[PDB]
C-alpha cells in the first residue's frame, strides 16, 4: 500500500524582500519513504538544500522538511519539485508569499 505525499511550499518567517529567510518544502503522509524533493530558484535546482530526519506519524506515513536559506526578491520565483512512486510525473508546487 502506497500513500501519495502532501506538499506545502512556504517560508519560515513572513516573506520580506531583501531579508534573509528559509524556503521550506514539507512532504508528509507518504509511503514508502523514498522521495525526491528539489527546491527550485527560477527553474534551477539549489545545491544547498537540507532536510530533517526521516520520521513518521501514527499511521506509519512519513514526513520530511526540506529547507534552505534564501533571500526573496520581487522577481525571483521559487518552487518545489516532488517525485514519488505514487506520481505519474514529478509535481511542482510554486511558492506563494
Amino acid at each position: 500500500i502506497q500513500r501519495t505525499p502532501k506538499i506545502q511550499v512556504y517560508s519560515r518567517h513572513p516573506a520580506e524582500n531583501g531579508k534573509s529567510n528559509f524556503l521550506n518544502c514539507y512532504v508528509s503522509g507518504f509511503h514508502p519513504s523514498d522521495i525526491e524533493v528539489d527546491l527550485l530558484k527560477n527553474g534551477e535546482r539549489i545545491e544547498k538544500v537540507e532536510h530533517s530526519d526521516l520520521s513518521f506519524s501514527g499511521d506509519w506515513s512519513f514526513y520530511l522538511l526540506y529547507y534552505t536559506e534564501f533571500t526573496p526578491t520581487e522577481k525571483d520565483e521559487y518552487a518545489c519539485r516532488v517525485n514519488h512512486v505514487t506520481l505519474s510525473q514529478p509535481k511542482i508546487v510554486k511558492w506563494d508569499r
Binding site: 506545502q8 519560515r12 509511503h31 514508502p32 530533517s52 530526519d53 526521516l54 520520521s55 506515513s61 522538511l65
Partner: protein
C-alpha cells in the same frame, strides 16, 4: 501532558534511521547514511549529557541496525518475497506522562506500512496481525521480551523523560503563542494564519455570525509550527466571519475579523 517518542525506520546494508521526540521537540537522531553514524543531539538540553550516555545510545542504534538487517531478511522469508524488492520495517514506542507517572506506554511495529505486531495495553501480551507476525510474537514470547518492555515503559522511559523535562524546562515546558493575522484574496477567500507556536496543538475555526479549508500543521524549521484555515465568502459579506484560535500559549482565546 508530556510524551517521549521514538520512531525507527529500516528500509531494504539497509538504511536505518532512528528519531526521538519529547513532545514536539526532536532531541536525537541516528542515520546509517552518515559519514560517522552515531547518536547525535538535536536539542540543547541533551547536549550536556556525558559521553557515556551518548556512546551507549550510539551502540544501541548500531546494534539495533544490525538487528533490523536480519529482521528484514527474516520478514522477507516469512512472506516468500523476492530478494530484489525493497521493504520497510517501522518501529514505534514511547511513554505518556498529570502527576509525572506513566499514563500509557506503547510499542508498535509495521512491515511495508501495515500494522505487524503491537504490545497490548496490559504490557504483558502481544497481538499479531497475520500468521507471519505469529512467528515474531512466538519469538518474543520465548524471550519474554514483554517483561523487558515493562522495565522500560513503566520505568526507564518515565524517569528519563522526567529528567529531560527538567533540564530543558526553559523550552520544553514553555508554550509559544501563535501570531495570527487574516489575509484576503479575491476569487469572485479569507485566510486566517497562525505562526510560530509551540506545541503544534492548535484549533483554527471560521465562524459566521464544515466549509473551511484546513491544512495540516507544518513545521517552521525553528522548533515552532504554522497552520492556516481558509474559507470562501461572497463579496460584501466579509464582516460576518470571525477566526478563532485556541492554543495553550494564549491567556484567553483569540477572535479575528477582516
Amino acid at each position: 501532558s508530556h510524551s517521549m517518542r521514538y520512531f525507527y525506520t529500516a528500509v531494504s546494508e539497509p538504511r536505518f534511521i532512528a528519531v526521538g521526540y519529547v513532545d514536539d521537540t526532536q532531541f536525537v537522531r541516528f542515520d546509517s547514511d552518515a559519514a560517522s553514524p552515531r547518536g547525535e543531539p538535536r536539542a540543547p538540553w541533551v547536549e550536556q549529557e556525558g559521553p557515556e550516555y551518548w556512546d551507549r545510545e550510539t551502540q544501541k542504534y548500531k546494534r539495533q541496525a544490525q538487528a533490523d538487517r536480519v529482521s528484514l531478511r527474516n520478514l522477507r522469508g516469512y512472506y516468500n518475497q523476492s530478494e530484489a524488492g525493497s521493504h520497510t520495517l517501522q518501529w514505534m514506542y514511547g511513554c505518556d506522562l498529570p502527576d509525572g507517572r506513566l499514563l500509557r506506554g506503547y510499542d508498535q511495529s509495521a512491515y511495508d506500512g501495515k500494522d505487524y505486531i503491537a504490545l497490548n495495553e496490559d504490557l504483558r501480551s502481544w497481538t499479531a496481525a497475520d500468521t507471519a507476525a505469529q512467528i515474531t510474537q512466538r519469538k518474543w514470547e520465548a524471550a519474554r521480551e514483554a517483561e523487558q518492555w515493562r522495565a522500560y515503559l513503566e520505568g526507564t522511559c518515565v524517569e528519563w523523560l522526567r529528567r529531560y523535562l527538567e533540564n530543558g524546562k526553559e523550552t520544553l515546558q514553555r508554550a509559544e503563542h501563535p501570531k495570527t493575522h487574516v489575509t484576503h484574496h479575491p476569487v469572485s477567500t479569507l485566510r486566517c494564519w497562525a505562526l510560530g507556536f509551540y506545541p503544534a496543538e492548535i484549533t483554527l475555526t471560521w465562524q459566521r455570525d464544515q466549509d473551511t479549508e484546513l491544512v495540516e500543521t507544518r513545521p517552521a524549521g525553528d522548533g515552532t509550527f504554522q497552520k492556516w484555515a481558509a474559507v470562501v465568502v461572497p463579496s460584501g459579506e466579509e464582516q460576518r466571519y470571525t477566526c478563532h484560535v485556541q492554543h495553550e500559549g494564549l491567556p484567553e482565546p483569540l477572535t479575528l475579523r477582516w
